[PDB]
Design a protein around this ligand. Sequence first.
Ligand SMILES: *[C@@H]1O[C@H](CO)[C@@H](O[C@@H]2O[C@H](CO)[C@@H](O)[C@H](O)[C@H]2NC(C)=O)[C@H](O)[C@H]1NC(C)=O
Ligand SMILES: *[C@@H]1O[C@H](CO)[C@@H](O)[C@H](O)[C@H]1NC(C)=O
Ligand SMILES: *[C@H]1O[C@H](CO)[C@@H](O)[C@H](O)[C@@H]1O
Ligand SMILES: *[C@H]1O[C@H](CO)[C@@H](O)[C@H](O)[C@@H]1O
Length: 467
Amino acid sequence: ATLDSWLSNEATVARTAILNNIGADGAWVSGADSGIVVASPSTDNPDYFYTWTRDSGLVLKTLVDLFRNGDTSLLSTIENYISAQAIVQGISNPSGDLSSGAGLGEPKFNVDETAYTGSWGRPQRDGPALRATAMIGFGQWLLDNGYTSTATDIVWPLVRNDLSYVAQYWNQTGYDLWEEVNGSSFFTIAVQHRALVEGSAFATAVGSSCSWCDSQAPEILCYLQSFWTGSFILANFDSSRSGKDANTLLGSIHTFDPEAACDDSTFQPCSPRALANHKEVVDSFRSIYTLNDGLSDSEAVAVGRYPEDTYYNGNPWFLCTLAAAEQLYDALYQWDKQGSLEVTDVSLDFFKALYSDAATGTYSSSSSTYSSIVDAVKTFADGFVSIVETHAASNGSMSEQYDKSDGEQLSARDLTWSYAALLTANNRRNSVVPASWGETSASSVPGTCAATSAIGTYSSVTVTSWP
Ligand SMILES: *[C@@H]1O[C@H](CO)[C@@H](O[C@@H]2O[C@H](CO)[C@@H](O)[C@H](O)[C@H]2NC(C)=O)[C@H](O)[C@H]1NC(C)=O
Ligand SMILES: *[C@@H]1O[C@H](CO)[C@@H](O)[C@H](O)[C@H]1NC(C)=O
Ligand SMILES: *[C@H]1O[C@H](CO)[C@@H](O)[C@H](O)[C@@H]1O
Ligand SMILES: *[C@H]1O[C@H](CO)[C@@H](O)[C@H](O)[C@@H]1O
């Protein structure tokens, strides 16, 4: 009731906003190539006129989701991005060459498909996974509508390069999703795990093999366990920060599997760890912003990246505020699809701050307890999006961040990611979900975590024809 009017109307502007940010024929990005997702049109203060593989990948996943839920008009925009990545994967850069393997870690490029040869927090090893993920799902659609040549000769060998990457380089160090902390990032490892699992499944589906996907996936999932502290999920290893970061919120929602239970080992949205993490991570912003003064632990607050952040002084982020909501909406989906809502001693505070009478127990859909909690949850999540609404522009625009005291838009305008974050949260509020990646099978923690690698092949896809 309280935001549907705005959500559905905003979601319309979000779709078109993304398309204006993708060349060659996007309104706000003249000079960009066909299928290059510019992160933001802003060309100074700040100059975001580039194309980040991460940003490109998270957006295209969202576009693939929509496309498969019946928005078939996205076909050319999605395709165009496939042909773009063909050229992009082969751009030799400060991080490396394509035949090397390294340099699929290259955080960003120019909009004309040329390397960025300036200093940058490189490499970031999330990108290759995040691309393969976005591509894989459109591969599945191609298969399940009989376009096998495009699925086998164009889509697979792009996804083969990125899979080859993740298996080889995962256990080596690199910079986080915020481009700041050199180490091992949770988000990075989470989204990398998903890629080899769903990439193995998809590579089997084109009459082929991803032998390296298989060996390493449990090893990454083995490593992943270590990020849990008991209290919450650590953002990065090798950091003097608290470890509370939106990083982890995003790791959950972008590895959310619908055919899956509240599994602590893959850190799903309804899992005790991610639930505890949401309590901890969101709390960490309560007092540090003047914008959130007089907003109790039952109500929602403007959410940032992390409390140690000093970038633009360190404000609330729209996509991060939208991530707080999205985990909760995936939680509400998974409790519905289960017919259960386990309160554990781990999660306890998460519920207790929203539902005063919350306590340790399993409570099915039928119970009084479930009904009261999911109202409180729905309201809490609805709370964040209401804050997103408030500081969103009159014509529906969203920036990267919004001021810490008074909430005005700050940093890069028309951030492509912000719109994708909106399109995703809104979807999950209306029970719209993405195809499973195979979590059911990939939940067993191994015996011992082996700091190892495995190798693939690396081969350059030419944009040959269109079958
Ligand atoms: C490479 O992988 C190994 C496990 O395969 C990781 O080892 C863990 O590292 C964390 C953080 O230092 C420790 O708390 C664990 O106790 C380690 N476990 C073991 C068995 O060594 C290692 O951190 C990984 N490193 C990178 C950069 O990926
Ligand atoms: C809203 O108007 C501003 C004016 O500069 C524009 O830059 C922004 O892209 C607009 N948003 C739309 C049309 O969604
Ligand atoms: C490696 O594989 C790629 C993509 O299938 C080809 O373009 C290349 O010629 C080599 O066979
Ligand atoms: C694969 O890599 C080669 C060498 O960079 C390119 O020429 C080709 O277009 C594709 O990107």
